[PDB]
Amino acid sequence: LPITGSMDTAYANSTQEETFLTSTLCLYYPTEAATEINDNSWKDTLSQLFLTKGWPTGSVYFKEYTNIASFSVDPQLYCDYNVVLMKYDATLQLDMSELADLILNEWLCNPMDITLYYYQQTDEANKWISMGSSCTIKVCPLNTQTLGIGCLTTDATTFEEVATAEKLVITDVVDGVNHKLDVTTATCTIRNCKKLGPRENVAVIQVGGSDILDITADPTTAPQTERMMRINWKKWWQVFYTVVDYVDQIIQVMSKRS
Amino acid sequence: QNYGINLPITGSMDTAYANSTQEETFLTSTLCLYYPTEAATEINDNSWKDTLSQLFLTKGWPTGSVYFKEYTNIASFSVDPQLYCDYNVVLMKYDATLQLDMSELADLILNEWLCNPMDITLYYYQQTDEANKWISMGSSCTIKVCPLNTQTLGIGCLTTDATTFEEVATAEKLVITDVVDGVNHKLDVTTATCTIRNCKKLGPRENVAVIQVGGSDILDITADPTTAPQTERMMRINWKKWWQVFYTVVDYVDQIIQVMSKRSRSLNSAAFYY
Amino acid sequence: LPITGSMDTAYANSTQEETFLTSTLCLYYPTEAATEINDNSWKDTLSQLFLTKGWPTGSVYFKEYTNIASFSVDPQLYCDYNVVLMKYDATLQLDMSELADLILNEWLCNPMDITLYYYQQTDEANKWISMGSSCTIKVCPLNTQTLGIGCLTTDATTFEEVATAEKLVITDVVDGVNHKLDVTTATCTIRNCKKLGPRENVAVIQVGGSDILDITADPTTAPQTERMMRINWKKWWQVFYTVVDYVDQIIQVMSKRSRSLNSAAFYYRV
Amino acid sequence: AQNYGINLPITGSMDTAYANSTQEETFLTSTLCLYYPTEAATEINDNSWKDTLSQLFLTKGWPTGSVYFKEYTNIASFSVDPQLYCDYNVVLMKYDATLQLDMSELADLILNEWLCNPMDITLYYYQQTDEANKWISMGSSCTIKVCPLNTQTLGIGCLTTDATTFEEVATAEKLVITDVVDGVNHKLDVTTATCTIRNCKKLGPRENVAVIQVGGSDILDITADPTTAPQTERMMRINWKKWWQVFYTVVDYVDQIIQVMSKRSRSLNSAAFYYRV
Amino acid sequence: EYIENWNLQNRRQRTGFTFHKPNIFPYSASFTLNRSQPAHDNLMGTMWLNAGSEIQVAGFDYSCAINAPANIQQFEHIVPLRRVLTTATITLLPDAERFSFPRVINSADGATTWFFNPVILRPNNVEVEFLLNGQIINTYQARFGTIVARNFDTIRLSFQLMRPPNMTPAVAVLFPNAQPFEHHATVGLTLRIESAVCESVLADASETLLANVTSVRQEYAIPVGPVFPPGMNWTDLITNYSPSREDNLQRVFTVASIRSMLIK
Amino acid sequence: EYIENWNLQNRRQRTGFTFHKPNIFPYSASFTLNRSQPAHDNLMGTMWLNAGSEIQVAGFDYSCAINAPANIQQFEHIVPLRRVLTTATITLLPDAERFSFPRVINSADGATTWFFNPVILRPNNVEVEFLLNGQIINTYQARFGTIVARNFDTIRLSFQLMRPPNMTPAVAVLFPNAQPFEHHATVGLTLRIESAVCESVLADASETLLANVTSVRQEYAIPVGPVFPPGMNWTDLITNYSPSREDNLQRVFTVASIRSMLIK
Amino acid sequence: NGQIINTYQARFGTIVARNFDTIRLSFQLMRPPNMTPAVAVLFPNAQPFEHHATVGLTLRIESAVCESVLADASETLLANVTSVRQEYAIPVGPVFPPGMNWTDLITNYSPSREDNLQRVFTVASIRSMLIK
Ligand SMILES: CC(=O)N[C@@H]1[C@@H](O)[C@H](O)[C@@H](CO)O[C@H]1O
Ligand SMILES: CC(=O)N[C@@H]1[C@@H](O)[C@H](O)[C@@H](CO)O[C@H]1O
Ligand SMILES: CC(=O)N[C@@H]1[C@@H](O)[C@H](O)[C@@H](CO)O[C@H]1O
Ligand SMILES: [Ca+2]
Ligand SMILES: [Ca+2]
Ligand SMILES: [Ca+2]
Ligand SMILES: [Ca+2]
Ligand SMILES: [Ca+2]
Ligand SMILES: [Ca+2]
Ligand SMILES: [Ca+2]
Ligand SMILES: [Ca+2]
Ligand SMILES: [Zn+2]
């Protein structure tokens, strides 16, 4: 479906005010934020501050999460625009990369039955995304004869584990090689998801720290897009007010879900 | 406009690239930089200033044009804006806890700030655009802000007492408060030890060259989360001994000064008080 | 000799197969990887995974080190394409940059004499590289009168100390100033070296952390070059599998090394 | 709205019509500050004389919050750090007869734009480049001792190691403006604990401030040059019996005192990149 | 020449007006997005400038054919003419110069703007065809410089973008496999009709007859009639070049040639 | 044509020389900074190339009118001619191609150099006016392609840069509200006189008469006289095109036309 | 045409200029190195200058031959043209300035205005022969 258009037609007027009157955004803040916030009616306070900047009174919602590990199991992102106040912890170096790999990208996905079948990467694009309370992936490769490469197929201890006790795992093993894996499937579900592209209805605001997000899979690219932002954070109220002030720029680097 | 500001200049695109004036740049002007007290503690020489000043005298500068000024930490350096000489380079040591404070120091020093003082017990205040901020300096002041309704009632607080006010700054030297631009705000600033004022950001002070000694890049010297532009004069090196750092500065002064310009020197300080 | 190529010439076929089948590949990992892997013949397992990607049956070599300090005492980069996998430490903030300086750049190096002669630096291209078990370098400037400024020529306590207890130092100091040295000669070996260009068969893979590596000691530039990658780790198996299956994009960011040296070290060539 | 550091030649016609009065808009827009000694507010005997004056300034044209009142104890303590803030400044100072260099150095700071560099006395020997270079020191107690060197770094009449062989140009003074011979490298002995000295260059006059000498004769020598003692437009003097006559005179003649000064030439947006503060 | 072609067309014989750079193309600067989305970060399609005697076309892909079959993306640009040109010398160059620098462009509905940061590959497999009534008269496969087109009324440019299979490390950082493409692959052609023989009247860069007609119609403040466009807009005159407008244009150009003989 | 215009101007009647791409513009490649500072990081003003028959102009703003009133910055470029052109066909295109790629440019005094990294917006509200003695003869408002200008000696181009009110996330990262602008907004026009009738003699891309005059004056090593520029510099000849130099140029061009009839 | 036809270096009195259309005056102010005490009080090194240094020239074209028509102090032809146009209350036409402003006529002295001015001055010379 080719979409053509002239290169001297008029610029339409700023449809930012209509986007404010129509859309529905929601920020996801951690629980220790709500500990430092110390208010019972700060939700109405902030939502009236959003009312000052054009958003109507039923357009802004405030949802919580406990930490990055607890938010990593099923983030829903049901609003029109989404920003997450992803708080930097220096001990968890790859967890933020996992969460931003999940939320910022479109994952067309399929399920995975571990007992029946064997699995592999069709190209670079798909990964083994596993979610649950405790994911202990154990992958062993197989050759073209379905013999164990460096393991025994009936021994689960000679398997070569790539993650343990982790909420959200995005597993990468070699492309063209057949594999058999072991999951404690009672507490974790794995499925192979290709990334089609990016999610334009979500943004990440890294609260403190440094630019660490290697949301791509390979080491060869670590690009920083427009919706991966970073603040410096002495107190929380400064950066709640920063989001409420510069919502006209944050919505500008995002797009509607449809 | 009595310096020819409304009048346009007309270049010619084909002037012969007349001369090179790097040596006249390095002759009558002054270059002074700020180093922490822990630097001169690990240096532990009584006359290392003589050693370095002779090494600056190698690199084109005359002798009486390089000054050394201490500071205790980034908090005790930010108790007042002091930018002394013609060419300035500032040497901060990275600390992971002192995270916003380095960005606050670079936000004051790198940019130009036209400022008017604020009267918090009498009047109400707001911010006009992105450039308006509330810079507050002092020994220790807790800033408790509360927004206001359009009929002067407190949004989620009570303007009669100070407990229900919302704090944005607890016992810090130099705050750049950013609030929402629409509503008015009732303020609780401990003015016995503090001085708060509103300040517009301008075209930035083109001289001061921030040299981050250690760490990674952290300096979000803007307000929005959208942009963190690492401009020309925010450099960063790594340290094991300070002598390597000072030798690096003396060696690459030819590269550092060509990244700044002395034409943006103010008169006394770094606050442009009206 | 100037080459004069046309613009409308046809693109040749993809020669990554002829690059895989007629070259080698070394992977360097710290021994913490070897104690977290916990397998006897995982070099066989990993090399059979490389065999799927077109690399031949024994054309991928594995060589170990303990830490960044003990690898920088002599980085002997053996084979035709060298990836090094370097674990991030916040305390090893500059020494990781020292090792990434030494293995990602071409240097011309001759030995130096300290007791007899003393040396200066010509421009920003030459620096003073010193390797050994412990390099405590204490340097003092001089002048046309060859008297020490801010120090004493005889007294070694009055010297200006740039590095202590360090395996690999790259001392930068000012140009056109005569400098007298104090290096522990019986342990540390020092050389001055001119930076010609980039050593180009090396991918440093910062395994964890943040991008810090300021190679060019000029503060005005911090060149994040193409062969300086950063992966974040939880288990090493993730890192090794990522290096195996993105191997074409990691040989693609390298080129053939183009410099005729004279030292004639060992090479793992096909 | 551009070309901030170029110094372009203007071209104005000599047949342009004269603009309108502009004085009412200057009174509505800008701000005024009045600095008075504390002996005034002693003899005034009021707490609300500020509001009485401010309503008389309202009669003259200024708004209520446009006229600011600050005070000082004596000329010596005002001269510790004179930081003069607002758009139009005028200072009242009484002629103490025994201090005459103090008022002249005070008006030498206040009525001139000073571009000043720092100093380090322990390191460097300092020479003055030309006449507009002065050495301005301020603090609690300045005691400056100068040692003239020859061209070989050997002191002329002063041992470079001894400090008692040095000769003092001022002792125990708050602000000192030191002029020495130009071209000779000098060693200093400023008491750096209670005094900071700075390498200053007189760019020109300061355009926003006048000085009213309340009582006492014409003494003001701005330019540290014996041949010229300039009497500019903003070195006014009046005679006093009570202070109320002085305050009613400065309130009656606002339209002359604001007239003989202007807006500060540096503080405009047009002087953006020529030393703006 | 004009009175000769007047007398030959008054007896219905074949005529030919020889033009140097004829204004056969109406001004049409536009584009086409074969692959698009409201994010405008992965686009694919052609852009063109048809002006005077010059076609500058450029097909761009943001992915640089990283998921296209055989890493080859086929572009195509078909320009129909209004009158049949005959014996045309045409300068065909690669690498269209106007669509080779970064620009921001309004969308199709004019709502939002999108950014275009091109890097230029050479055009692989250029096929320039000169169609008359749908039949291929002349064809040129990967031949640049001066070409000839003997009889045509449609110009079909078929160039394709091929991803380079061998890339140095300076090139491999430009085109990742992932989504953020800060450098967009762009392939262009330029086609300039230097001289052509057309049976109908036109305007070109050599004669001044259209200038004389517009000068007479604008000097005496003439109302807009039934045939010619308001203000003698040549773009609107060659956009809808009807045979009645053709007859009026030929008559008025012949009279303009007569007056240009007498009045200088 | 030359002996006809010789005989008509010997009796003081109106003449016209028909030129294909006349060299009416002297070579003037320069710029103008309406807003500038020694940092050269927030600049505003026009750049132009006047060469032969072609004007390429481009007004740039580094802020992209982020503080201009109504987000619109007005540019203007006035080109005075030396002789009055008559009945000129002019190709007016947007998006000046020469001032659309990054370059470093010396300053006005030639002291320092400044960097220019353009991204191209389309020209909003183009007004091209053709002035004769200060009176607007022809005007064209947002019309590109081929235009006509019947009688003029001054060309006034009035284009403006409007900040786009709706921007995708690929565009919104280019133009921040703060100071560091790594991508500078630039808006251009191109104006090419294809053919024109001028009463005075000129040079153009069709005749070779100036080439014959310079070949005769350079072949026989002729000293520089009182009228013509040294080396027959056409830029210095059309920069100061006095009527005595006009008479000498017309006489020598007429004799060159005579010799070009005989000697090939 | 940008070429120096005549030049005169520190020569006053009557000079001659054979062919020109631009006059370039290049004078300079030199501070006197030796000054009596009556002069040295005028020019201090400091800022208040109550006496300002000023250097002038005067250039008066007494007579000249011009190819185009002009007005001068000898003829009365412009006066006759303006007297006829002002006596009979004539509306402002397309060429000449309103009220026959000679400053606005020589400011923008176009060749069509030159032709009109020469024709009307020739007719004014004819009428000045007949009518006194
Ligand atoms: C331009 C447009 O899109 N429509 C309206 C227009 O009718 C109105 O005149 C203009 C005022 O600036 O505001 C626009 O929203
Ligand atoms: C099947 C076939 O024709 N093979 C050719 C091969 O000969 C050529 O060397 C190569 C270059 O990459 O292109 C292939 O298509
Ligand atoms: C608005 C303005 O300033 N102009 C007025 C002018 O209209 C008036 O005729 C004149 C009378 O003297 O006074 C000026 O101030
Ligand atoms: Ca195993
Ligand atoms: Ca894979
Ligand atoms: Ca509250
Ligand atoms: Ca704000
Ligand atoms: Ca020492
Ligand atoms: Ca060096
Ligand atoms: Ca003595
Ligand atoms: Ca002196
Ligand atoms: Zn042509």
Residue numbers in the entry:
A (entry chain d): 57 to 314
B (entry chain c): 51 to 324
C (entry chain e): 57 to 326
D (entry chain n): 50 to 326
E (entry chain D), F (entry chain C): 134 to 397
G (entry chain N): 266 to 397
Anything the authors wrote about it?
To obtain high-resolution maps of activated and inactivated particles, TLP from cells infected with rotavirus in the presence of trypsin (TR-TLP), or in its absence in medium supplemented with the protease inhibitor leupeptin (NTR-TLP), were purified by density gradient ultracentrifugation and characterized by SDS-PAGE. Three-dimensional reconstructions (3DR) of NTR- and TR-TLP were computed using SPA with imposition of icosahedral symmetry, achieving resolutions of 3.40 Å and 3.48 Å for NTR- and TR-TLP, respectively. The 3D architecture of the treated and untreated spikes showed a similar average density. However, the NTR spike was slightly shorter and wider than the TR spike, and had an additional density at the base, consistent with the lectin domain of the VP4-C subunit previously described in these particles. While the density of the VP2, VP6 and VP7 shells exhibited a homogeneous high local resolution, the spike showed a radial decrease in resolution as it extended away from the outer shell surface, with particularly low resolution in the body and head regions. In addition, although the VP4-C lectin domain was detected, it was observed with low density, which has been associated with flexibility. These limitations hinder the construction of reliable VP4 atomic coordinates in the spike density and require further density improvement for accurate interpretation. The resulting maps provided sufficient quality to support full atomic modelling in the foot and stalk domains, while in the body and head regions, a combination of backbone tracing and rigid-body fitting was applied (representative examples of model-to-map fitting for each region are shown in S8 Fig). These enhanced densities, together with the icosahedral 3DR of the complete NTR and TR TLPs, were used to build and refine the full asymmetric subunits, including all VP2, VP4, VP6, and VP7 chains.
The infectivity of rotavirus (RV), the leading cause of childhood diarrhea, hinges on the activation of viral particles through the proteolysis of the spike protein by trypsin-like proteases in the host intestinal lumen. The RV virion is an icosahedral triple layered particle in which the segmented viral genome and the polymerase complexes are packaged in a capsid made of the VP2 protein. The external layer is formed by trimers of the VP7 glycoprotein in phase with the underlaying VP6 shell and 60 trimeric VP4 spikes, which project from the VP7 layer, that clamps them and partially covers their base. This outer layer is responsible for the first steps of RV infection: attachment to cell surface receptors, lipid bilayer penetration, and release of the double-layered particle (DLP) into the cytosol, where transcription of the viral genome is initiated.
